[PDB]
Amino acid sequence: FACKTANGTAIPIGGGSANVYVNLAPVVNVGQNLVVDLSTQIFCHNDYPETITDYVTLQRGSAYGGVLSNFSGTVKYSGSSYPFPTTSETPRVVYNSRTDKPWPVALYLTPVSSAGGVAIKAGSLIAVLILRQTNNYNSDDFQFVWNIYANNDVVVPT
């Protein structure tokens, strides 16, 4: 089991850390969600699906910088929705193929009432998402840590 991104970063068997750089809607109003869809960015696969089934959770999701300060968030993982920053590990998604499958995570971030201005700075860390992978084969329990960075400023009109 290993993962790769659209930015050309990757994390091998056994886990590790990688950076993800995302384009964000440049203008978002109070009451509207800024969507950060990581399923277009992060892809994983099973290396031996002929014999092994892999299980993948979002173990934890943390917010940083402007995102933590200026937004109320939710995270959707494989059809279900939770508070973001997270308060529990998600259910497992089965990875049963060697063909790359998107990691089905998206953040929905809505500016708080007082968030006006540059609410996220270009280049800043906005989130850290921990993917936890296990299987039905042995005791493997690996963390794939994704540091999510903004490629651009996001402005909330006032």
Ligand X SMILES: OCC#Cc1ccc(O[C@H]2O[C@H](CO)[C@@H](O)[C@H](O)[C@@H]2O)cc1
* Site for ligand X contains 137 (CB under 6 A): yes
Supply 121's token pair: 């700075």
* Site for ligand X contains 153 (CB under 6 A): no
* Site for ligand X contains 1 (CB under 6 A): yes
Closer residue to ligand X in complex, CB, 114/136: 136
Report the distance separating Cα 109 and Cα 84, nearest Å.
9
Give every CB contact of residue 158 below 8 A, 6+ residues apart in sequence: 116, 117
User: 3-state class of 66 per DSSP?
Assistant: helix
Q: How far is the CB of 113 from ligand X (least distance, A)?
A: 45
Q: Among 120, 135, 144, 150, indicate the residue that binds ligand X (CB under 6 A).
A: 135
* Site for ligand X contains 43 (CB under 6 A): no
Closer residue to ligand X in complex, CB, 138/158: 138
Return the range that interacts with ligand X (CB under 6 A); candidates 21-29, 41-49, 78-86, 111-119.
41-49
The sign of the torsion formed by the CA atoms of 74, 76, 81, 87 equals negative
Range 50-89, binding ligand X (CB under 6 A): 52, 54
The sign of the torsion formed by the CA atoms of 67, 69, 74, 78 equals positive
* Site for ligand X contains 47 (CB under 6 A): yes
* Site for ligand X contains 46 (CB under 6 A): yes
Q: Is 138 exposed, middle or buried (0-12, 13-18, 19+ CB in 10 A)?
A: exposed
Task: Please list, residue by residue across 107-125, b when 16 or more beta carbons sit within 10 angstroms of its beta carbon and e when fewer do.
Answer: bbbbbeeebeeebbeeeeb
* Site for ligand X contains 141 (CB under 6 A): no
The binding site for ligand X (CB under 6 A) comprises 1, 13, 46-48, 52, 54, 135, 137, 140
